[PDB]
């Protein structure tokens, strides 16, 4: 590959806590500490739609493109769903009795997971009236991040300030396993490597480290050091051999996913970094990050997302 980073679109706003790419429209969703959410076309740089959802922080937001929805979770305990074409608020319910940190959407089935400061993950089913179909209990501190395994989304991972990642199966009440990270300040984020050649997950911590894990053996594969403040997230790029992380040190870091050495450090000048998204199909190798003072959409270069794409 050849890293060739271009700034596609950056704009200033209140602190961006959640961020996501639409899979077929050139849109990015940002969810703000102010309770506002913005939908931007980053190619034309024109706001498609925006909503003052609540007065509390909105920490989580995802597209559900197959329903033309966004789904968001906020510190006022509520999950809300809006149709992004009409602005219709579809549903609005109390989901947890404490802050909602993270929302994940199943790739094919009508399932949403929410992770919360109430120590739980909850599974909601939108084809069943958004009923609470399962609550996953076992964590001992705030659940900061939930992520389905894209290679087997009957399973998902929860990253928790109790220093563990728990991996669960839908329909079963205890973890398939609990991975102890040695990241003593807790886990802020968890992501799966999406390709079938490595059974890998990655965790980010306030302890300044990022760790790569074999989820079949539970062994630490590598520890990535160099962020100088809390690491907010770390993710595998879906098609490029890299890892991308962001930190309260104000930087994004791009790491070689084979050597585990840092390749690039970028401070985009928006202060602390909080959240990350990568384009679902690697379109123009777009990534986006949200920060204290706004967001940025970057293109990482021209390497193809599909073998023999040209």
Numbering used by the authors: 1 to 310
Reproduce, without paraphrasing, sentences from the article in which this PDB structure was first reported:
The first structure obtained was that of yeast β'1-304His6 in the presence of the CTFKKTN motif derived from yeast Wbp1 (Supplemental Experimental Procedures). This structure, solved at 1.8 Å resolution by SIRAS, showed that the WD-repeat domains pack one on top of the other in the lattice. The C-terminal His6 tag from one molecule reaches to the top surface of its neighbor, specifically occupying a charged surface patch. This structure suggested a potential binding site for short basic linear motifs, particularly highlighting the importance of a terminal carboxylate group and backbone carbonyl binding. The CTFKKTN peptide included in crystal trials was not visible in the density but was required for crystallization, likely forming weak interactions that facilitated crystal packing. Based on indirect evidence from structures, we predicted a D98A D117A mutant would abolish interaction with the -5 lysine. This prediction was based on the position of a histidine residue equivalent to the -5 lysine in the β'1-304His6 structure and of the symmetry copy K261 in the β'1-304 structure, both of which occupy the D98/D117 patch. In addition to the carboxylate group binding to the basic patch formed of R15/K17/R59, two carbonyl groups from the -2 and -3 positions in the motif backbone must fit into a groove formed by R59 and R101; the carbonyl group at the -4 position also likely contacts R101, as observed in the β'1-304His6 structure.
COPI mediates retrograde trafficking from the Golgi to the endoplasmic reticulum (ER) and within the Golgi stack, sorting transmembrane proteins bearing C-terminal KKxx or KxKxx motifs. The heptameric COPI complex (α/β/β'/γ/δ/ε/ζ) is recruited en bloc onto Golgi membranes (Hara-Kuge et al., 1994) but can be divided conceptually into two subcomplexes. The α/β'/ε B-subcomplex has been likened to clathrin because α-COP, β'-COP, and clathrin contain N-terminal WD-repeat (also referred to as β-propeller) domains and C-terminal α-solenoid domains and because recent studies have suggested that β'-COP, like clathrin, can form trimers. We demonstrate that N-terminal WD-repeat domains of α- and β'-COP directly bind dilysine motifs and establish the molecular bases for the interactions using X-ray crystallography, structure-directed mutagenesis, and isothermal titration calorimetry (ITC).
